[PDB]
């Protein structure tokens, strides 16, 4: 069964001040639209959108009847200096069992860097 607590953790490290990290989370339950919760179990709404993430770790999860979760993100550089690095890890879980992972490293070239990513708990290999 694919039904359980669907969770996606986004982590950033490096020159975090020289980038803008924008992430959006969406999920589905066996009943319909899923409620979203943070690590402390606080309700976030049915869509969780964080613009210019300042935290080094962002987490989003469903209830026990979750069927899917998607995380879409964008990385935009805010520096004219080349060689600024951002490390991103996107880890997907179903009942605290890792089901998917994306590891990315972004490096500035002097021009505006516009990068995107999309990770889901139900992505087929």
Cα–Cα dist 8/113, whole Å: 24
CA 58 to chain centre: 7
Residues 88/11, Cβ–Cβ less than 8 Å: yes
Residue listed under structure tokens 């943070």: 38
Q: Which of 22, 121, 38 is nearest to 72 (CA)?
A: 22
Cα–Cα dist 6/37, whole Å: 10
What technique determined this structure?
X-ray
Q: Which of 48, 104, 52, 103 is nearest to 77 (CA)?
A: 52
| 3-state DSSP assignment of residue 62 | coil
Resolution attained, angstroms: 2.5
Domains of the chain by residue range: 1-125
* 1-125: CATH architecture: Sandwich (2.60)
């Amino acid at each position: 069964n694919t039904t359980g607590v669907h969770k996606i953790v986004v982590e950033q490290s490096g020159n975090t001040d020289d980038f803008d990290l924008n992430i959006a989370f969406g999920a589905a339950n066996t009943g319909g639209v899923a409620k979203l919760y943070n690590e402390n179990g606080e309700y976030l709404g049915d869509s969780y959108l964080v613009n210019k993430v300042t935290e080094n770790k962002i987490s989003c999860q469903t209830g026990k009847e979750g069927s899917m979760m998607t995380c879409a993100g964008s990385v935009i550089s805010t520096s004219e200096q080349a060689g600024k690095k951002l490390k991103i890890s996107v880890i997907a879980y179903i009942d605290n069992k890792e089901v998917n992972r994306l590891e990315k490293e972004y490096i500035t070239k002097g021009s505006t860097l516009v990068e995107n990513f999309s990770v889901s708990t139900t992505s087929v290999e």
